[PDB]
Short mmCIF file of N, CA, C and O and ligand atoms in Angstrom, two decimals:
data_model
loop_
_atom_site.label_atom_id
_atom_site.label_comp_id
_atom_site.label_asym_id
_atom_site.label_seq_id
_atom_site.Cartn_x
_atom_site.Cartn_y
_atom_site.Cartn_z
N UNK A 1 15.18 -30.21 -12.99
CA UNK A 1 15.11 -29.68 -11.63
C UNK A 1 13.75 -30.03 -10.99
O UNK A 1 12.68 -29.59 -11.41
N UNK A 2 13.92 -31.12 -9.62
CA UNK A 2 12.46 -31.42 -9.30
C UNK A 2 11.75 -30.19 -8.48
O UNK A 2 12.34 -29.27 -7.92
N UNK A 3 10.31 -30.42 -8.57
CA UNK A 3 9.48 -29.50 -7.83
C UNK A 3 9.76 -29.27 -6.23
O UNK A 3 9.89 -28.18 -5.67
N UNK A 4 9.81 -30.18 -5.81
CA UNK A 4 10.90 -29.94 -4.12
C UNK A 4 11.92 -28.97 -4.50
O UNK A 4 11.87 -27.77 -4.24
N UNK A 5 12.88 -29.60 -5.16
CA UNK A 5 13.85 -28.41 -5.25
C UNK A 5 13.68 -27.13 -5.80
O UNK A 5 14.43 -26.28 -5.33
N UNK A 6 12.79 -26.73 -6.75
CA UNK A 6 12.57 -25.49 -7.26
C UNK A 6 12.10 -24.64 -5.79
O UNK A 6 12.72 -23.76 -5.18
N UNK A 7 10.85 -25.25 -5.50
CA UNK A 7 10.14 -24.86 -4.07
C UNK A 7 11.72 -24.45 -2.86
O UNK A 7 11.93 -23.37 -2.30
N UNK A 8 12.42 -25.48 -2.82
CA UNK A 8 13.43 -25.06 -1.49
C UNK A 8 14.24 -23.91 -2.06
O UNK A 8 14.87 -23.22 -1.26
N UNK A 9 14.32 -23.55 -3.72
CA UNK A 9 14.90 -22.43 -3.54
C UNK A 9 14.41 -21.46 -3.91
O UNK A 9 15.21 -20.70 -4.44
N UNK A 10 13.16 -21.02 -3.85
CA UNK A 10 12.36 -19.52 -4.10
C UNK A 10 12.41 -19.58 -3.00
O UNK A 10 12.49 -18.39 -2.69
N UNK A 11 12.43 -20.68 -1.23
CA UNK A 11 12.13 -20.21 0.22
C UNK A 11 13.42 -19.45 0.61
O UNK A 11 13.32 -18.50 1.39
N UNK A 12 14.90 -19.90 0.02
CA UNK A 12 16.54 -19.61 -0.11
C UNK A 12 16.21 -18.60 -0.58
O UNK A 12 16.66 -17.65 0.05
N UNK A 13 15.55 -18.30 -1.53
CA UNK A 13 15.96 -17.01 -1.97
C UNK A 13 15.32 -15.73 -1.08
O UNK A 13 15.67 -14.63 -1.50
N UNK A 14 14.55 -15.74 -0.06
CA UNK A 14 14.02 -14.58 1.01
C UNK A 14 14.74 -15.10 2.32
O UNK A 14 14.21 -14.89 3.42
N UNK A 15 15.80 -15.68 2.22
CA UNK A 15 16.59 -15.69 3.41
C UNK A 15 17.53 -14.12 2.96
O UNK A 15 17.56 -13.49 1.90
N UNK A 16 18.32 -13.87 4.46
CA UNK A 16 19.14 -12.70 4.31
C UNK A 16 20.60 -13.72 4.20
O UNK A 16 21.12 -14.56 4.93
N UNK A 17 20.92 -13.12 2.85
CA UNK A 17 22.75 -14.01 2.31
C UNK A 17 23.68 -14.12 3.14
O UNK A 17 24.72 -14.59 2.68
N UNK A 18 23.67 -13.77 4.54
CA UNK A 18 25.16 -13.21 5.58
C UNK A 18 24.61 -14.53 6.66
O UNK A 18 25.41 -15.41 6.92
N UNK A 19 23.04 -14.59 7.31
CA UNK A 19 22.67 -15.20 8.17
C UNK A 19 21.97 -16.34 7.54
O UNK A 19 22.18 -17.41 8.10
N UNK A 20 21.35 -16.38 6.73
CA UNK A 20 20.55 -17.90 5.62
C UNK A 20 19.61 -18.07 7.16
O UNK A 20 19.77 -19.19 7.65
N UNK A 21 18.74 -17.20 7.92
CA UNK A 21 18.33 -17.76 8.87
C UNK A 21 17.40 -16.37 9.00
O UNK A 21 16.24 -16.74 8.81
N UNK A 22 17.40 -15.47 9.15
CA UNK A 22 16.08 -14.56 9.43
C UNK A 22 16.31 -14.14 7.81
O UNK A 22 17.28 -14.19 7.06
N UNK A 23 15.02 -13.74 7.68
CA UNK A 23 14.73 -13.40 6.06
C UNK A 23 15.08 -11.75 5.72
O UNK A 23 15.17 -10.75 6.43
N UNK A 24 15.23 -12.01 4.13
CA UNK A 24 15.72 -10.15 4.05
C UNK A 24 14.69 -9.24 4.25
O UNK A 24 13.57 -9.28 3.73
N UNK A 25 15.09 -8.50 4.96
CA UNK A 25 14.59 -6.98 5.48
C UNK A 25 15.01 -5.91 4.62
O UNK A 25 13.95 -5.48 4.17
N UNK A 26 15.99 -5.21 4.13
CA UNK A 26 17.08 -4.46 4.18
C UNK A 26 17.22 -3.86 2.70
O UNK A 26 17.63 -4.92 2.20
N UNK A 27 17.21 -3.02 1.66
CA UNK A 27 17.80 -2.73 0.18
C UNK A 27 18.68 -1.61 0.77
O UNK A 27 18.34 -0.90 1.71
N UNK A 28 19.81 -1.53 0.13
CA UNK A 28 20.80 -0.60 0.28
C UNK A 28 20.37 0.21 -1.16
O UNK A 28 20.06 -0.03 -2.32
N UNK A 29 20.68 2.00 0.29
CA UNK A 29 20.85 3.12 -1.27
C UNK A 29 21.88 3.79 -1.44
O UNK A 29 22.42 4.48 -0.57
N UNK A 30 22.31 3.63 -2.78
CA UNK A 30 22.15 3.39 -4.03
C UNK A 30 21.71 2.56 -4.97
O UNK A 30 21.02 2.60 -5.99
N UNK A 31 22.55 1.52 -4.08
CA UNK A 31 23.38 0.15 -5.04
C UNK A 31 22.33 -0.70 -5.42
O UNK A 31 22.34 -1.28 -6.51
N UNK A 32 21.05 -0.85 -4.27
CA UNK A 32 19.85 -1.58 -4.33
C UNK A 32 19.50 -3.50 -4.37
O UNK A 32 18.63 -4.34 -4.60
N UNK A 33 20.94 -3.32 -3.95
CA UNK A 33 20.81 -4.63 -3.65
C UNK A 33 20.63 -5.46 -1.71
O UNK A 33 21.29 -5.43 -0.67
N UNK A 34 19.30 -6.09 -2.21
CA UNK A 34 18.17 -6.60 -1.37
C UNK A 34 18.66 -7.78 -1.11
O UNK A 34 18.06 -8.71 -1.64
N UNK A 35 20.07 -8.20 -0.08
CA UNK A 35 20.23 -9.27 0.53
C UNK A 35 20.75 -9.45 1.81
O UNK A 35 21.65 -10.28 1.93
N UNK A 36 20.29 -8.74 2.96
CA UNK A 36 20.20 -8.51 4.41
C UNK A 36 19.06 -8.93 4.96
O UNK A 36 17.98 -9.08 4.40
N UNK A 37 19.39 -9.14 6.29
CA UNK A 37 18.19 -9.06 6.96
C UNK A 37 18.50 -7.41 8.06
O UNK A 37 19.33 -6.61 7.62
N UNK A 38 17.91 -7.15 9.16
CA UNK A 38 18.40 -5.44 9.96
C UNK A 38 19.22 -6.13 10.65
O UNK A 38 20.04 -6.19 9.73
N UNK A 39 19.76 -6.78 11.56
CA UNK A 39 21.09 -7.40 12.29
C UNK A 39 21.70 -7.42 11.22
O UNK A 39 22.48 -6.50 11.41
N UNK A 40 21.96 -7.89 9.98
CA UNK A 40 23.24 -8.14 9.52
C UNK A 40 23.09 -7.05 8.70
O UNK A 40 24.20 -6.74 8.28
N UNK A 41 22.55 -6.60 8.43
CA UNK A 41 22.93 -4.65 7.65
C UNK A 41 23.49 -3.85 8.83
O UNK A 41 24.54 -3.27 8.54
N UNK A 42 23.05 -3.67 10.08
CA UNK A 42 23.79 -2.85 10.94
C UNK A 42 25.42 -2.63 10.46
O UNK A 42 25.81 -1.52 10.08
N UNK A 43 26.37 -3.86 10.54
CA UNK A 43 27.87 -3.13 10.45
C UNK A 43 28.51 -3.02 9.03
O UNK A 43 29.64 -2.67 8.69
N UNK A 44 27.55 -3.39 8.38
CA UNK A 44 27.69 -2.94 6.57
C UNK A 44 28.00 -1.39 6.52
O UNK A 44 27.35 -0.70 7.30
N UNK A 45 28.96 -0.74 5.66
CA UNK A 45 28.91 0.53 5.43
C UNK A 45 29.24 0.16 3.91
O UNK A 45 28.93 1.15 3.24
N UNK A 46 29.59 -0.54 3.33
CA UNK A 46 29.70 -0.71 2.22
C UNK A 46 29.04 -2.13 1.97
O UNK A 46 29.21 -3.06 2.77
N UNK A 47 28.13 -2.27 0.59
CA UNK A 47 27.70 -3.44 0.20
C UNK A 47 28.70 -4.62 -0.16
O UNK A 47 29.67 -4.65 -0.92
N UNK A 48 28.01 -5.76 0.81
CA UNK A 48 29.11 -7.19 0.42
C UNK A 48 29.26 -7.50 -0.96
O UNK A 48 30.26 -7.99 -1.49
N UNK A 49 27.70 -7.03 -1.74
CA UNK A 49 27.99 -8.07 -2.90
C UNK A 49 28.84 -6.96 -4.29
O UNK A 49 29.37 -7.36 -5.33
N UNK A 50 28.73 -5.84 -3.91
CA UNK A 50 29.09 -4.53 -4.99
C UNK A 50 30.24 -4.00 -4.28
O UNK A 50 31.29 -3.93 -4.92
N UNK A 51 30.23 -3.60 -3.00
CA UNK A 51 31.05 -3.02 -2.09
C UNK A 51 30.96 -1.05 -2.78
O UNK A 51 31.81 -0.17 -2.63
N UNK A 52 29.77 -0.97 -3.42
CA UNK A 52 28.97 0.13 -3.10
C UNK A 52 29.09 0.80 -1.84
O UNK A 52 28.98 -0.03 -0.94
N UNK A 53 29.35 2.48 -1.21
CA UNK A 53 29.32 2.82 -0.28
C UNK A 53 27.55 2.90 -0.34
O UNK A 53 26.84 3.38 -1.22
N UNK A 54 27.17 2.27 0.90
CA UNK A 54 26.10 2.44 1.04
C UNK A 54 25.67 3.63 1.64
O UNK A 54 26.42 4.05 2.52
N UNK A 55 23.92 4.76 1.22
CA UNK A 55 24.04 5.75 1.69
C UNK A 55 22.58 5.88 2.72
O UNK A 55 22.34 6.72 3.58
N UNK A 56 21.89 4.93 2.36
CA UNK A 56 20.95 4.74 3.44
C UNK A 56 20.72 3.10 3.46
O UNK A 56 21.16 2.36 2.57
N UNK A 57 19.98 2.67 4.61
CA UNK A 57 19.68 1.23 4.59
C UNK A 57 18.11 1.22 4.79
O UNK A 57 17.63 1.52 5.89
N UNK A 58 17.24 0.82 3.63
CA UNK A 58 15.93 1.20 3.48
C UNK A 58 15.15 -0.18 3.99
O UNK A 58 15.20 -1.15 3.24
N UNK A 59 14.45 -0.28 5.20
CA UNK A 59 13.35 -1.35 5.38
C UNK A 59 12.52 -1.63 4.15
O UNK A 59 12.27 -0.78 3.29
N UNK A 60 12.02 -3.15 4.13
CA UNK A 60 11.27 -3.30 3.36
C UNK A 60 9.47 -4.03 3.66
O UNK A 60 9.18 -4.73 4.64
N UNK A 61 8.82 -3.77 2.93
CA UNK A 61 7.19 -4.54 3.58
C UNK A 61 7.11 -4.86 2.34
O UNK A 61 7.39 -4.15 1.37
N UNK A 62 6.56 -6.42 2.37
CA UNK A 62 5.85 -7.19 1.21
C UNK A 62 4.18 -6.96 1.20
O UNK A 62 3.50 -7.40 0.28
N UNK A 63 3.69 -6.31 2.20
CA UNK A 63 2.58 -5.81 2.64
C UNK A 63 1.56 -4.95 3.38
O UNK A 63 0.36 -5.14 3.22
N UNK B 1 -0.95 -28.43 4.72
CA UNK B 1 -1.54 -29.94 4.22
C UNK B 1 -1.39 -29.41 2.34
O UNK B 1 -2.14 -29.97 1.53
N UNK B 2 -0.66 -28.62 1.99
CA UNK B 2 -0.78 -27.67 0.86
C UNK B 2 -0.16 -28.93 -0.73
O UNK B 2 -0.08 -30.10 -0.33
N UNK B 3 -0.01 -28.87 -1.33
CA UNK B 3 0.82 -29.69 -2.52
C UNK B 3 2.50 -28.67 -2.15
O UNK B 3 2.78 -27.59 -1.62
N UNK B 4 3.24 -29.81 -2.80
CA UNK B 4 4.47 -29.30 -3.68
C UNK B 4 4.26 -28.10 -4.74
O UNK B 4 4.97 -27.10 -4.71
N UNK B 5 3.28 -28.29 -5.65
CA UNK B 5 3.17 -27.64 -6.71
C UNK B 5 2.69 -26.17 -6.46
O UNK B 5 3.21 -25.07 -6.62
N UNK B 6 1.29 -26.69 -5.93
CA UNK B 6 0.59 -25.88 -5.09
C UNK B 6 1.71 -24.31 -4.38
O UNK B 6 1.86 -23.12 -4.66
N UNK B 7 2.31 -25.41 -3.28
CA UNK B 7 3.14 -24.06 -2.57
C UNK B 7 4.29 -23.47 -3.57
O UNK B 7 4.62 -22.30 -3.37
N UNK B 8 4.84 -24.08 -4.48
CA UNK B 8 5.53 -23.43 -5.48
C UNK B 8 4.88 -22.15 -6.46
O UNK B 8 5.51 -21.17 -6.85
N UNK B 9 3.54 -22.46 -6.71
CA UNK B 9 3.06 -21.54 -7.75
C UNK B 9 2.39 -20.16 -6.65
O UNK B 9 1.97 -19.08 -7.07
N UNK B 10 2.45 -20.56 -5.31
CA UNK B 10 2.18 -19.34 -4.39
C UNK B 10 3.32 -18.41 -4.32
O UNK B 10 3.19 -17.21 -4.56
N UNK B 11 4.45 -18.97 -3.98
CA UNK B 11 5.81 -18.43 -3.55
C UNK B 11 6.14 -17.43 -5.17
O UNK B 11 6.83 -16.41 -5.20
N UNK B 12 5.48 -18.03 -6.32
CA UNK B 12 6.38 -17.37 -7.86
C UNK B 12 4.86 -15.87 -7.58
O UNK B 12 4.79 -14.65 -7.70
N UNK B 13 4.29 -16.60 -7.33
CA UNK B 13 2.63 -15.56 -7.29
C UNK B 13 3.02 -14.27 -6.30
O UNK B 13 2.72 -13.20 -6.81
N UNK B 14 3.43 -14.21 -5.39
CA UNK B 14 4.28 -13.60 -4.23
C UNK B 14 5.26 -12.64 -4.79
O UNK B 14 5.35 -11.63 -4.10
N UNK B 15 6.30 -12.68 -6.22
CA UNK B 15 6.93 -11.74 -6.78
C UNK B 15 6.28 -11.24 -7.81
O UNK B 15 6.97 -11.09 -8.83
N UNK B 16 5.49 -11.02 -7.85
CA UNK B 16 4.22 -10.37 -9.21
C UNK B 16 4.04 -9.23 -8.67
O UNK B 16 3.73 -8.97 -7.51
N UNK B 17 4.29 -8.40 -9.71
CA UNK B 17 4.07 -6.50 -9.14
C UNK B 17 2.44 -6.62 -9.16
O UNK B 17 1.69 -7.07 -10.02
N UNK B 18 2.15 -6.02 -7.78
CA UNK B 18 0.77 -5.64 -7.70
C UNK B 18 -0.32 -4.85 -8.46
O UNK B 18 -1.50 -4.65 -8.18
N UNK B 19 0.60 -4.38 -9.70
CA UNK B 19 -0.10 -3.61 -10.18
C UNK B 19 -0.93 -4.23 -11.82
O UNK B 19 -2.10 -4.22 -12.19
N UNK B 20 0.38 -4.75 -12.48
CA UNK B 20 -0.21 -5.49 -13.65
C UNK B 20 -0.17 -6.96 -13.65
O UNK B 20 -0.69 -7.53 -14.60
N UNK B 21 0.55 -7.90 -12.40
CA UNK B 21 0.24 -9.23 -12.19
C UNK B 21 1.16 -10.04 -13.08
O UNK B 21 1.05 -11.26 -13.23
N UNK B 22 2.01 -9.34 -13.60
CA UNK B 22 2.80 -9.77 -14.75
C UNK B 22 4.23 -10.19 -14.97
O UNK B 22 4.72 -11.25 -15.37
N UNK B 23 4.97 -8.56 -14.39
CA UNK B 23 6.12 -8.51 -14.76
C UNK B 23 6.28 -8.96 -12.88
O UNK B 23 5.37 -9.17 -12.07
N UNK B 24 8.19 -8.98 -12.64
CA UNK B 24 7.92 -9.48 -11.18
C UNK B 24 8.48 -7.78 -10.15
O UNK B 24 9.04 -6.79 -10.62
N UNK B 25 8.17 -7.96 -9.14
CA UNK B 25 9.08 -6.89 -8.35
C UNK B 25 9.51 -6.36 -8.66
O UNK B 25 9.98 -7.02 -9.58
N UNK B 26 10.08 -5.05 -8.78
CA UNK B 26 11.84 -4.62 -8.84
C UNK B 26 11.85 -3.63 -8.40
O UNK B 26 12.70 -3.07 -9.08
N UNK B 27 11.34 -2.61 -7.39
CA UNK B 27 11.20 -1.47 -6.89
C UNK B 27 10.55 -1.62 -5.58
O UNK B 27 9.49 -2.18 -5.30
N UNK B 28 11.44 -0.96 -4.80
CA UNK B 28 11.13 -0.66 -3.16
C UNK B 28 10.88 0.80 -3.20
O UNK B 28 11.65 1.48 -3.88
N UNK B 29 9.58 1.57 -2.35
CA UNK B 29 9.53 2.98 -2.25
C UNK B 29 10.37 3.08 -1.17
O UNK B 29 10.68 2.23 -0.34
N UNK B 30 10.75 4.38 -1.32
CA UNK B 30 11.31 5.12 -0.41
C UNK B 30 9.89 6.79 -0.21
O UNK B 30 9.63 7.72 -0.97
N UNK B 31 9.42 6.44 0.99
CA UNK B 31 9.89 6.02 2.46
C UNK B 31 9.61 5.32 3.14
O UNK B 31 10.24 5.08 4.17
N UNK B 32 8.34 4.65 2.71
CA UNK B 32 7.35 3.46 3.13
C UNK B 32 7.87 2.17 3.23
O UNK B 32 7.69 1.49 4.24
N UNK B 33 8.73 1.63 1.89
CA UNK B 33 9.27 0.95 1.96
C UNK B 33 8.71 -0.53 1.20
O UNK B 33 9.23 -1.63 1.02
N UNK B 34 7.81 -0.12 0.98
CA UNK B 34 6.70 -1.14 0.24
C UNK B 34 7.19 -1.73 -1.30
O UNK B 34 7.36 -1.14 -2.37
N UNK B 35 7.30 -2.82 -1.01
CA UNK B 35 7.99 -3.65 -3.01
C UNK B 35 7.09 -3.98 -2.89
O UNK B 35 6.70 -4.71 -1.98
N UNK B 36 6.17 -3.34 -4.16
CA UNK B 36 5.20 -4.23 -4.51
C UNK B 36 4.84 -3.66 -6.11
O UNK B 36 3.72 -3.77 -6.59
N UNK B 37 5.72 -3.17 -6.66
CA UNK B 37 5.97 -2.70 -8.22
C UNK B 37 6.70 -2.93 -8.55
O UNK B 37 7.77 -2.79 -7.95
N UNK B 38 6.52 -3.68 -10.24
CA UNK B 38 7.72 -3.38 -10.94
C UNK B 38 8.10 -2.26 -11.37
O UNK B 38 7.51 -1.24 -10.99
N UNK B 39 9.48 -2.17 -12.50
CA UNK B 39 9.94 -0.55 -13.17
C UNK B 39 8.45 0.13 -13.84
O UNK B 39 7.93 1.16 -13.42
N UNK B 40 8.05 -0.54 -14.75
CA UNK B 40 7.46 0.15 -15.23
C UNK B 40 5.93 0.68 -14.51
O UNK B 40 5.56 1.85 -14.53
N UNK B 41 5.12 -0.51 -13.86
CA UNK B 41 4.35 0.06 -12.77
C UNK B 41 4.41 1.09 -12.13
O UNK B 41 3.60 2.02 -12.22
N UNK B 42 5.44 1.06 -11.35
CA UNK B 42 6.09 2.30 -10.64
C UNK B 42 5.87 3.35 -11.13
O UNK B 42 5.09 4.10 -10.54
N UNK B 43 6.39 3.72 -12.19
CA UNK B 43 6.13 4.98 -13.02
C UNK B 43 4.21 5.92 -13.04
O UNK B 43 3.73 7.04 -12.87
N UNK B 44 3.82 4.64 -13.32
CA UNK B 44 2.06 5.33 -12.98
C UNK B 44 1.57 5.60 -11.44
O UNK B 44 0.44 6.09 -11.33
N UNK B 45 2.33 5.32 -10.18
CA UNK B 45 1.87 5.65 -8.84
C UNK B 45 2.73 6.55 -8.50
O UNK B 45 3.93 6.59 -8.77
N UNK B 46 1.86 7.56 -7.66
CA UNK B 46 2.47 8.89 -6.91
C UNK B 46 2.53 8.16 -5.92
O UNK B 46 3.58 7.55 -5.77
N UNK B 47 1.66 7.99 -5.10
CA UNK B 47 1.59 7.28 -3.67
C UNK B 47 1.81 5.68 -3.52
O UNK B 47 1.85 5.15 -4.63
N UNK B 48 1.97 4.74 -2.40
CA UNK B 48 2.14 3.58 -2.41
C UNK B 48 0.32 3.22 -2.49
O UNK B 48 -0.49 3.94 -1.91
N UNK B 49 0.02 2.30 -3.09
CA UNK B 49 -0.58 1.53 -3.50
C UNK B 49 -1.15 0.24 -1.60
O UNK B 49 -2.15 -0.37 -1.24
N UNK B 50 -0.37 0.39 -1.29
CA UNK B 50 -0.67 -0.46 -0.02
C UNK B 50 -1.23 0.57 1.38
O UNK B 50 -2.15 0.26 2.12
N UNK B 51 -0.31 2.01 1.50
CA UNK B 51 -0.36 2.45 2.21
C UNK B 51 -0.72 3.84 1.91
O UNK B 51 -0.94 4.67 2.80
N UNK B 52 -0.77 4.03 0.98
CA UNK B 52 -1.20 5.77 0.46
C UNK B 52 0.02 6.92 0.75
O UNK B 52 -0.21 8.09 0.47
N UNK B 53 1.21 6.55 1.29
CA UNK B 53 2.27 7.25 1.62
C UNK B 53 2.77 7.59 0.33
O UNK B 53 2.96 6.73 -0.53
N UNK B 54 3.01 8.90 0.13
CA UNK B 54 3.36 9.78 -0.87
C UNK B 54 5.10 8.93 -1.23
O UNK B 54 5.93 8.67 -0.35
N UNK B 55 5.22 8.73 -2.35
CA UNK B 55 6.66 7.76 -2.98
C UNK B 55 7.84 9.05 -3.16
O UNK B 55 7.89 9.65 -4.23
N UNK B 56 8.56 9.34 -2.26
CA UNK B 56 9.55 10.09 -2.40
C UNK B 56 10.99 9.80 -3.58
O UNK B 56 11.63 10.58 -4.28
N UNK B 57 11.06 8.74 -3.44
CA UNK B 57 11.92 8.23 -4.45
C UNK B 57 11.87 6.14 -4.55
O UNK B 57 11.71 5.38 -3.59
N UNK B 58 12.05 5.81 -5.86
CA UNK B 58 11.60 4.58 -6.52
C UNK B 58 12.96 4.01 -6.65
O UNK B 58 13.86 4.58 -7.26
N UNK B 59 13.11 2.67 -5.94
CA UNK B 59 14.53 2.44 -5.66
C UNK B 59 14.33 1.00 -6.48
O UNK B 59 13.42 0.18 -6.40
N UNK B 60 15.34 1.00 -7.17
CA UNK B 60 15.16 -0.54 -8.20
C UNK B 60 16.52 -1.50 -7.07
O UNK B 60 17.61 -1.26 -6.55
N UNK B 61 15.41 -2.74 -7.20
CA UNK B 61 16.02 -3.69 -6.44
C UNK B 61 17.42 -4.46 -7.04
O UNK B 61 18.03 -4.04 -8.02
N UNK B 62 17.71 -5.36 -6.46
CA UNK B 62 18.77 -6.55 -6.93
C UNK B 62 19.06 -7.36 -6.02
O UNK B 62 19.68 -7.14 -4.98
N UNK B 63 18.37 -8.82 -6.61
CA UNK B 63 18.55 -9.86 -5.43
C UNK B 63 19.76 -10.68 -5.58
O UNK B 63 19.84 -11.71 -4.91
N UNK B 64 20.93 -10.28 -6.55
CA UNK B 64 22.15 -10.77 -6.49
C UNK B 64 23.07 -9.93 -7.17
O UNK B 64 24.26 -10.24 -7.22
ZN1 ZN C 1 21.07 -11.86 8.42
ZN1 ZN C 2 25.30 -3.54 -3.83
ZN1 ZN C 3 3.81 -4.07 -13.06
ZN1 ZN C 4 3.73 1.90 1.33
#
């Protein structure tokens, strides 16, 4: 796996999974899975990737 | 003007819990909201570490 490609996908991996275009924002509680950005968590009530009822939608800061 | 390599070993440096530099992420506080601990880190802070906001509850992540 070349170094370009490793690099293009740790940047893939802080995209939000629904839009691949604004980065994740978003961990759902319980379930805790961190792959939204806040537009595409809004009409989630249940998680895409668990389908977990979600019970809060928690912002996140890397800083 | 950065390297390939260079910006790769920033981006892996970027999921390192702030606390022991080691293990990577895996906990978002609740209410602050701050990932910047892993599980076991977590366990030694009352407050966030970035912001001093008291950690109401320690939410373990999952990025798939
Ligand atoms: Zn999105
Ligand atoms: Zn889930
Ligand atoms: Zn740690
Ligand atoms: Zn905080």
């Amino acid at each position: 796996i070349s170094t370009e490609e490793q690099l293009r996908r740790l940047q893939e991996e802080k995209l939000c999974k629904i839009c691949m275009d604004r980065n994740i924002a978003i961990v759902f509680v319980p379930c805790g899975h961190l792959v939204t950005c806040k537009q595409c968590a809004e009409a989630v009530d249940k998680c895409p990737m668990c389908y977990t009822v979600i019970t809060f939608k928690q912002k996140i800061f890397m800083s």
